Each structure stands twice: as C-alpha cells, then as structure tokens.
Subunit: 257 residues, 4 copies
C-alpha cells in the first residue's frame, strides 16, 4: 500500500533541498519523476541518480504560460500523470514595518500563486484524463503559526493551506486528493540563509539562533529534508486514500494539530 | 470595560455592510471615526449619523500611496490615532479549475494586500507616536475552512489570519494588539452577490441557497453586520487587553476554535 | 450591549482566583451573582464586596446531588437564572509516568465532570423556563496545547472544550449559548506554591520558572485573574450573541486560534 | 522506511472493527502483534490468522491491574515491545441533558482512562528497556469537533488528543513518539448501532442517517476500517519519525487540520 510503482510524478522546485528529497523518495517508492525547476541543470543532476529514470524541465512557477508549458512537456515525457508535489517556495526575512511591496510580491507570487497555478493546471489534466490524481503541496510551520520577521511569508503559506483545503473540497467528488505538508526547521540552503538574516536582525550569532530552533523542537534536533520527503510519499500513496485537505505537520513536535 | 471614549479610529471599507456597522458601533462606544473607502459619498453618509462626528476619506486599499495618503489625512483630521479596523474586502466565485489570474489578484490585492498595507502603515504611526494602538482585521469563516467555489478567496483570507498572527507576535512587545474576526453568513451586498453566484453555479434558486446557509447555522438565523460589529468593539477595547493574534469566530456556531 | 443589568448568575468555584474575579466583573457589569464553591466562607467573602447583592452556597462539583441542590438554592435566592460560569478547577503537576489514578480522577472529576454536571443541570433549568441562557466554562491554554507535567490536567481541560462544543451544538437551536475561555499563565495566590513545585520538578529555581513564563508571553507580563474575567463578561453579554462553542484564548499571545 | 519487520506490537481493543484491521495491517507490514481485548475469544480468532505469530490476552482497559497484567503477559510472549496502538473505545448516544453518570463514566473510563493506563504503562516499559517506542492512539473526528448526541463521547475523545499532545512533549526527548488518528464515519458495529440510535433520536430512518454521513464526506463514501489502519501503519513506521503529538484526520475530507 505504500508502493508508487507505475505512477508518474511532477515535482515543482525539485532541484534542491526538500524538493530534491521528495523526488528521490518518490522514485525510491516506485514512481517516475519529472522535476520542474528554475534551475534545470540542477534538476538533471537529481534525475541522474533516480532508479526509474526521469525528466528535467525548466519552469518559473510565478508565470502561467511557463507552468502550462512545463507541465505539458513533463506529461508528454512521462507518458502520463498521476501525482503533483508542488514544492517551489522562497522566503525573505524582515521586520513587519519594513517589508517591501517587492518582497511581499516575491513571497506571494512563488509560494501562493505558484502552488495555485501548478495545482490548477494539474487538476485540469487529471480531469481531462479521468485520473484519480494526487497533489501534495509544501506549506510550512508558518501556515499554522504566524512567525515574526516572516509575516509576509507566513501570510503566503497560510494561503497555501487555505487553497489546499478549498481545492480538496472541490476535487474530492472527482476522486482527486489534495494535501499539504508543514515542515519545521529544515536544514537546507533556505535555513542557512535564514539563520544569518535572523541573527543580524535579532543581534545574535547564527549559532545561537540555530540552538534556539533545536531548543524549541521536542524531538531535540534540527529537521532534515528526508524527514519531510518520507511523509510526502505517504500522502502520495494509497495508504492515504481517505485523507484530503490536510496540513500534515512534520516538525518534530513543534506544532500539534 | 468596553468604553472607547476619546479613541480615534480608522475603518477601511466602512461605507457599507460590516464596515459601516463597525463604524457605528465604535462611535456608539465613544470613539471618533474616520472611514476610508472607495465609496466616499456613502462613507460621508455613515459619518453624518455618528454621535462623535468623524471623517470620510477616499482610499484604494490595493495601493500603498493611496493608503499612506488616506491614513495621514484621517489622522490629521482626527487629531490622533488609536485603532484601525481593516475591513475592506471583495470576493468572486468560480470553480477552482476556472479561476482567472485577474480574479486571483483582485481577491489577494484587496483582501490580503489591503490588510498588509493598512496594518503596516498603522503600526508605523503607532510606533512613531508611542501609542498602544489596536488593530482589528476582518477575515472570514473562509480563513478557517477552505470553501469550494471560493478557493482563491479562502486563500486570501487565510493569508489575512496568518499575517494577523505574525504581526501580533512582532507588535506585542510594543504593546500593540492585532486580532481578526471571522464572520459567517452575513447579510450584506456581498451575501446577495454570492447567493446569486452560487445559485447560478449549482442550478438553485438564490433563496434556496440562503436557506441552506441558515440550515448550516446552529443559532438558526442569518447573521447581521451588527453581530460582527459588537465583537470588533470588544476586541478594540481594554476588555481584550490580554488578547492578541486571534481569529475570533462570529458565525453563530458554524465554526468553533 | 455589554451590560448584564438584571441578569442572574451562578459562578462555580467563585471563591478565589479567576472565579472570584469573574464574580466581581459580572457584578460590576450589572448582574446579581451566586457563588457555589467548596469553601462557602471564602464564597461569602467575595459576595460581601459585591454591589448588587448575591448569595453564597456550598457545593462539591464532583457530585450530582450536591450540584443539583446548590443550583436549586442559588436559583431560589436569585429569583431567576440567566448565566452560568463554571469555573471550579484543580491541578496537580506530575511527570506523566508517575501520575496516580487518584490524581487522574481528581482532575477529571473536578475539571471535566464538574463542568458536565453544572452545565447539564443549568441547561435543564434554562430549557424548563424557556430561558435564553448563557454558559461560560473556564477551560485552559492546556485545552489547546497539551502541557508537559500536566498531561492529565490537559486531558481534562481538552474534555471541557469538547464538551463545550458538542453542548453548544445541541443548545443553539434552543437559543442557549455555551462558550469557554482558555486562560494562560495566571497569577493566583496558589502560584507561589505551584511555581516552587514546578521548579523542583524541572531542576530550576522558582524565580527562573516565573521568568520563563514571562519570556514566553508576547504581551510581556504574567496574566491576572482580571484579564480573564473581563472576557467572560463579554461572552456572557449580548455583544457575544452570535458566538457559541468557542474556546476563546486569553493568554497574552501565547496561543492563537 | 514503511517496514515494521521484527517489531513487537500491542493493540488494545484489537478484537474487531478498527482494532482488528490495525492488528492485521501491522502484521502485514512485518510486526508480531499481541491483541489485548475485553473479548479474548474474538482476539484469539484474529491472532490465529496473523502471518507473524502473535498473542491474544484478555484486558479491561478501565482497570490498572488489568492493564498492567495484560501488557506484561504480552511483552513476555512477544519477547520485546516496540509499539502500542491503544484502540479500545466505546460510545453511547444521548441528548446532552439526559446523559447519565453511568454512561459518562463508561465513555471516560474506556476512552480516556484506558488510553492513559495503556500509554503510561507502555512508556514505563519503553524507558526501562531504552526502546525507541511508538504509540498510536485511536481518537475520533469527535476529538476535533464536538458532536451533538455525543457530548460525553466527544469530551472523552478530546481528552485522548490532549493526553496525546502532552505525553508526546514529555516523551519526545526520550525518543518515544506518541500520535493519534481521528477517524470519520467508519462502517463497523459502532456505526450500525449508532445509525439506529441516531435515527430514533432524530426521527429519521437508519438508511437516511447513513446517507447523510456519506453526503457530508467529500470523498463520497462511508469509511472502512482499513482506511484508518493503513494510516496507523504509517504513524507506527519510521516514515513518521519526525512526527509526534499529532491528531491525524482520516475522515475523507470531513475535517481538515
Ligand atoms: N527549509 C525549511 O525549514 C522549510 C520549512 C518549511 C517550508 N519550507 C518550504 O519548502 C519548500 C522548499 O524549501 P527548501 O528549504 O528546500 O528551499 P530551497 O531554497 O532549498 O529550494 C527551493 C527550490 O524551489 C525552486 N524555486 C524557487 N523559485 C522558483 C520558481 N520561481 N520556479 C520554479 N522553481 C523555483 C528553486 O530553484 C529550488 O530548487 C518551499 O516551499 C519552502 O517555503 C522550507
Ligand atoms: N458578507 C459576508 O458573509 C462576509 C463574510 C465574511 C467576511 N466578510 C468580509 O467582511 C468584509 C466586509 O464585507 P461586506 O460583506 O460588508 O461587503 P460589502 O461589499 O457590503 O462592503 C465592502 C466594503 O469594502 C469597500 N471596498 C472594497 N474594495 C475596496 C478597496 N479596494 N479600497 C477601499 N474600500 C474597498 C467597499 O466600497 C465597501 O464599502 C470583507 O473583508 C469581506 O471579505 C464578509
Ligand atoms: N465511526 C466509527 O466506527 C468510529 C469513529 C471514530 C472513532 N472510532 C473509535 O475507533 C475505536 C474502535 O471503534 P469501532 O467502531 O472499531 O468499535 P467496536 O465497537 O467495533 O470495537 C471496540 C473494540 O474495543 C474493545 N473494548 C471495548 N471496551 C473495552 C475494555 N473496557 N477493555 C478492552 N477492550 C475493550 C471491544 O471488545 C472491541 O474489540 C474506538 O476508540 C472508537 O471510539 C470509531
């Protein structure tokens, strides 16, 4: 029941970080994966290590024409389409009173609009092929608890979750499932950037900010991309066949719902 | 104690519906109100009825320069500034697969960006004047439960709530409180449009749709703007002095948190 | 609309702390208050200072016969019954692996059973008289987030919240509202004592424990009973007429729902 | 990462319904399972069919002496102990004003106390043997939303979730995870019973009550035990290694968190 053999997957933002771990895990579980990413060279590198082969395609998830074209190219390459993991996201950090319109839009356009477009287009394909498709979106701990210095980011990730819920309600009568995962403090390049921004803004060392994240975590350690990826495999699989519209926390006990 | 005597309030989207009720209720409680709205003449008519006088100013909450200018004009007119109720909002209704970018941006730019802008600018003012300012944002039941045919609207209202939480956390050390309210099925012009849109989309009469809303409401009646307004007064007031970052449900029992 | 003039209230556990503050606030707002408490001398001490008179009655909220008789005596004394504030509660702090059955039962029977009996009997009274009755139960932050060292306490307070929601659903069609309040870190005369015990269990000093509670509170201070009581006034009043089944956080930003 | 090969499990309430499906699914995934149930005849019948051996033991989860003896007997039979699924539960349906003390106690003693005892004793064992132990408790949709006619049942299931969260926070530093699953409208004998009671209390047919549950489920069918059991497998597994303190909805989209 956890097997993804034969399934055809697209992972947006799959070149690096959590997305790459998702792609690797989906593949380990039996799927054939297309990675759509701003960095198509990094996508090809990930594909090189997948067991079932795969495909790399360039996409800018902020732009409808790009997402439409990327998705169609991936679907054509895969020879079908069963699963979307919409993972592309960004952050900037800033005191709320100083957030710029530019970075409000950067966060919204990638995190919320990028999920919208990939999801909307995915569902169009699923419906046109009468597929029991499955969507997993990457939200955040900040889709559950507003985070200081990330107020715009939090807003954008709450938007993901709300979109997820509503979409799920529309797609469930069509046997299309839509869920999201809410990671905690994940060791990737987004975290390494964040610790340095945060330390500066709070006047702390990077090391102390890190240690605070671990102190907040009941399981006692910083999170890895794989911690999230293995949960996305679950939500993609038929073990989760009676689950839709959820924001599954994968945070080590930080956030309980 | 629920008195707002001597407090200086700005209500965005106060010309009509919930915002007009909020303006009347704040004024009944002792505040002097400035209404900032697209519809300046309707705002002026609400102001005409208020006990403590007040001011009406044109604003388009989607635009930073407009919000900056309208807030400054209001604060100048009021002679101070203690309370922002950011209420302006819009909706469209569409199957998720058919949502346009135009209507995605219309919902986000008013609902989410407009709150952002009014709040951020309010907080700059409060901090510059050393005022223990208070914010009440109007979210929605759709900030708690994703609603079908309103997937983009829901996402935008989730974003309000996430923004509210994160700002509350930043503002709390400054003794500035930020909360939102989440109304249910409130009988305003927006309800009248939605009833019609939903009737159109589901092949029902608008009256049957409205009756279904009441059937879904434990307290057994359609909601009034005043149902909401009296809770905004509470949240504005010092009775709510130890409450910040909440999404207070005012739905007649439809949603419980 | 926030006035309780003419209303007749019963407060269980009104002798001390949050309950005493509730009784004093209800009275200030216009109500006539009966306090039902295990310590009737301490109840009478609170009644002595109230503006609108009132009545003190012995009760053991763990026993149905006691609650029925106290409630009946109180209603008789008041000449009516509009409002129940079910506040009686207890806690013991213990590592989860060392919780005794006695401590489990103590917590459940007072906190969860006590609310059940008082609420059930109140509702029987309201329904028999066709009264638009209101209930405010005192839950806890630990009804929202389970708390280490308070695992049985948390379970009991989650139960209060679930009870509140279900009862509210049943009662709403009969024009009876049922809400709860979820206080945070409240300074009562008992907390000197429960802080030393926590400090002992955690290998900290009492000072360090109290300071940590402040640190953890966005609004920057320990909570007072009055912070809660004023929100209870609101929930009792017709300002909250369109709210039912809620767990209203009064935590200074610690918990956001 | 989803394999439970070699692991030793105890399922309380595993004789029929959801519990039996849990016990089957854990076994299919590679575990050896002991079932502890009030009906040991039925438990033995399930155990007889398991691939990996197993053990049936009689338990009354409402009694500490019973739980301690049954768990020790199981652990001795299994030769180790890695996993507890505390599933035993009961319900009765009754209007909230008519709930008896006897049925309040029945619901609490099984549902909440029985999880407390099983979990507490399990953790004692895990800690003594330095075991990375895992607990999955069976809560309910009614741990998330209070259910009319089930107010006592809801309160007991809220308790299970709150216990789960608090215990998770205490156990997380010791490498022990504690989660719960919240099933929706699952077709078992609890449902066949309830459909009848509810139909009588509401003046409806049993068929119509069941139809109403389907109507309320976005995925559009009544839930099966296996829908729940497969998620339990996931939570038991190392795929869920960075998840603790959660109430995972398995409701077909009825409740989203
Ligand atoms: N690191 C964390 O703690 C954390 C926590 C919660 C959520 N998340 C979320 O997880 C997801 C991935 O985070 P990460 O930490 O792995 O970050 P990352 O910066 O490691 O990776 C981001 C990926 O998204 C792609 N991307 C960015 N903008 C894009 C665009 N416009 N079009 C297409 N692809 C684009 C990048 O090229 C990259 O492969 C994001 O949604 C992020 O918000 C991260
Ligand atoms: N009616 C409901 O059931 C309902 C439910 C939940 C939330 N809401 C929310 O409550 C708020 C008020 O809604 P309502 O039902 O009273 O709607 P309404 O249409 O009666 O009033 C909307 C007000 O917002 C103003 N407005 C719209 N866009 C604006 C802009 N760009 N700049 C300035 N002013 C603008 C309008 O001119 C109008 O005065 C909105 O945020 C809405 O999303 C309404
Ligand atoms: N719709 C549903 O059926 C539904 C929904 C949500 C939750 N649940 C929960 O799922 C769990 C199983 O429900 P089910 O529908 O499979 O019910 P069931 O009535 O079919 O099975 C109950 C099981 O628990 C056992 N049990 C009862 N009292 C016990 C005691 N004192 N000690 C030990 N064992 C005891 C029984 O012998 C039986 O094996 C329960 O916790 C129940 O509350 C069921």
């Amino acid at each position: 029941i956890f097997d993804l053999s034969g399934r055809k997957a697209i992972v947006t933002g799959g070149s690096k970080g959590i997305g790459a771990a998702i792609a690797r895990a989906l593949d380990k579980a039996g799927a054939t994966v297309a990675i759509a990413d701003l960095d198509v060279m990094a996508a090809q590198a990930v594909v090189a290590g997948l067991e079932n082969g795969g495909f790399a395609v360039e996409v800018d998830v902020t732009k409808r024409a790009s997402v439409d074209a990327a998705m169609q190219k991936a679907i054509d390459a895969l020879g079908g389409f069963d699963l979307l993991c919409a993972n592309a996201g960004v952050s900037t950090m800033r005191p709320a009173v100083d957030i710029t319109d530019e970075e409000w839009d950067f966060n919204f356009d990638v995190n919320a609009r990028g999920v919208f477009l990939a999801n909307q287009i995915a569902c169009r394909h699923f419906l046109a092929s009468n597929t029991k498709g499955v969507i997993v979106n990457t939200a955040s701990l900040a889709a559950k608890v507003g985070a200081p210095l990330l107020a715009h980011y939090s807003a954008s990730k709450f938007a993901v979750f709300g979109w997820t819920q509503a979409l799920a309600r529309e797609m469930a009568p069509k046997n299309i499932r839509v869920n999201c995962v809410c990671p905690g403090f994940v060791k990737t390049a987004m975290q390494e950037r964040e610790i340095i921004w945060e330390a500066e803004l709070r006047g702390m060392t990077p090391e102390a900010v890190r240690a605070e994240y671990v102190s907040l975590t009941p399981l006692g350690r910083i999170e890895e991309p794989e911690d999230v990826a293995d949960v996305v495999v679950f939500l993609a699989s038929d073990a989760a066949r009676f689950m839709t519209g959820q924001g599954i926390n994968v945070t080590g006990g930080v956030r309980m719902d």
